[PDB]
Design a protein around this ligand. Structure first.
Ligand code: PBV
Ligand code: PBV
Lengths: 325, 325
């Protein structure tokens, strides 16, 4: 029912956007079908974790606070696709990084996907009292993500910033705010129960869940083989500020740091193996299990503090936490 | 006084954005100075025609409708820099088209410039009654521009679309709405006198002025030498849907069309000269003077219809039209 309703609202959103281009923007059918195929390619196929999180938060707050139910659930699906379209926009920008008309279309796709989040919100929420506050929180989180991207891209340009506090800064602004905090907040807005929650504990939980997700993703990027990871792990070659790098530098000897700095950030298949060997010899996979266990306890305890004043809201946070756990 | 006040509000806007990153987004000084230099490089140096147009429309509507004057003029400067930041955002995307970290920073610059239009609006207009309507009209025009870019990039992919009505469609959506209609509308919003104008004649005037500007720009791109044009004219090599191309195809013989199709869209220095020769032999520069004269008369007459009900508002439109004339 959740996934089925989510995909049913997707057809409604796509039909409005494409028909609007046909009726108001004077677009020809060849380009309307072109944009339909592009919208399906970039927005459909993932796991829809961000979008479905908005629905799970909304359905809990209406049963644990009747035509208002049907409207809130529909508003959550539109908010769910706002984030999915936003995530589609971010991924398109990633492909541009890694008279050329395909690059021209890629940039155009990114601009269109971002604009579509505004267009679908200005339409389905035209008479909602929260349209202005929803767009401001949405735009501020998008700005936060762009700032987080700047922290990540320049993590090796200005190993000084290879610290655990800067790693959390990258994770907080580039991933945690739009993946964990935003879907939870959007569920509170469509349920109108925004000021009834502790935003401090909620913001704190969103950062810890994103941090837990990123550390696990960093270790899998280095040790999980490509066919089991779904991609080629490239953090070492790209010299990323991963959890493995900042944890190695704190417990390595003065020589192992020199051997790390001489082997990190290279495409040589053996230097990457030299970095993996250094990670192995430091028992980082053992430190990984302990570091994640401590984060998980901070998550388990913070959900209880949020349950005291927002009982039903914490049930969805545990469901969201289970997807990462 | 107009330019001096405009640059004075620029320092105020930049200081707020950078300090916000320092105080709220936990940004280090090295990156704050990096973003200051980037903001100056992309937003400063142009002619500020879009930004100053908002000021000229605002100052006319307050004298020809007193602490409200100082607020409206300041609100117009913020709106003026919203468009300049938006134009900076579009130009950055143009450079991307024509582990690489400079391309990564270019994409990041484009996302930051667009977000800054929202951030400066959500701050300086936080208590303005038009904040929601300003962001919706701003976002819809931005979406329009992205649609216009799609019409332009695909003008030769799907010479079928090389028609005069499709040329106006490209000019209307890609240039006219955000360069001519948006600065005029933003001047009406900060002056609160939006519903006191004929939006039909205003929209019609904005499209004609953009069309007049684009035709003149197309002819100069082909005939004005590089040192006098400020750039290398590349419309023929890029096979653009220029006014010269769609006018040639309507008055050329069946063979000249074949010679045009065989020479258009190539980088060969002689095929480009063959296309220029075909443009010369068709007296297109003579048709250019006549076509622009007819557009100018439509502009002169439409400003009079707008003066009947909006007298002071038409004075700024004539000033904006003079910059293109
Ligand atoms: C465009 C850079 C970016 C930011 C956030 C997420 C993501 N995948 N990519
Ligand atoms: C990014 C494509 C574009 C659109 C409008 C104007 C401009 N210069 N560039």
């Amino acid at each position: 029912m959740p996934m089925q309703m989510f995909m049913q609202v997707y057809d409604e959103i796509q039909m409005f956007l494409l028909e609007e281009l046909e009726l108001k923007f004077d677009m020809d059918p060849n380009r309307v079908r072109y944009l339909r195929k592009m919208m399906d390619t970039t927005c459909l196929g993932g796991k829809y974790n961000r979008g479905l999180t908005v629905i799970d938060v909304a359905e809990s707050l209406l049963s644990l606070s009747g035509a208002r139910r049907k409207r809130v659930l529909h508003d959550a699906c539109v908010c769910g696709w706002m984030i999915e379209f936003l995530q589609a926009h971010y991924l398109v920008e990633d492909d541009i990084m890694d008279p050329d008309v395909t690059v021209q279309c890629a940039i155009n796709d990114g601009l269109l996907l971002k604009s579509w989040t505004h267009m679908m919100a200005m339409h389905f929420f035209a008479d909602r009292p929260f349209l202005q506050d929803l767009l401001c929180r949405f735009n501020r989180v998008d700005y936060t993500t762009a700032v987080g991207q700047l922290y990540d891209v320049t993590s090796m340009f200005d190993f000084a910033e290879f610290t655990l506090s800067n790693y959390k800064r990258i994770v907080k602004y580039k991933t945690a705010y739009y993946t964990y905090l935003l879907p939870l907040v959007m569920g509170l807005i469509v349920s109108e129960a925004l000021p009834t929650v502790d935003m401090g504990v909620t913001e704190e939980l969103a950062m810890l869940m994103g941090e837990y997700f990123q550390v696990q993703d960093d270790v899998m990027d280095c040790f999980t083989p490509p066919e089991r990871l779904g991609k080629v792990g490239t953090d070492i070659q790209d010299a990323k500020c991963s959890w493995l790098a900042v944890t190695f530098l704190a417990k390595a000897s003065s020589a192992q740091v020199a051997e790390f700095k001489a082997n990190y950030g290279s495409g040589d298949s053996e230097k990457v193996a030299t970095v993996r060997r250094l990670y192995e010899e430091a028992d980082l996979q053992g430190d990984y299990v302990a570091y994640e266990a401590a984060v998980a306890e901070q998550v388990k305890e913070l959900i209880e503090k949020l349950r005291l004043c927002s009982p039903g809201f914490a049930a969805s946070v545990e469901t969201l936490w289970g997807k990462t756990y």
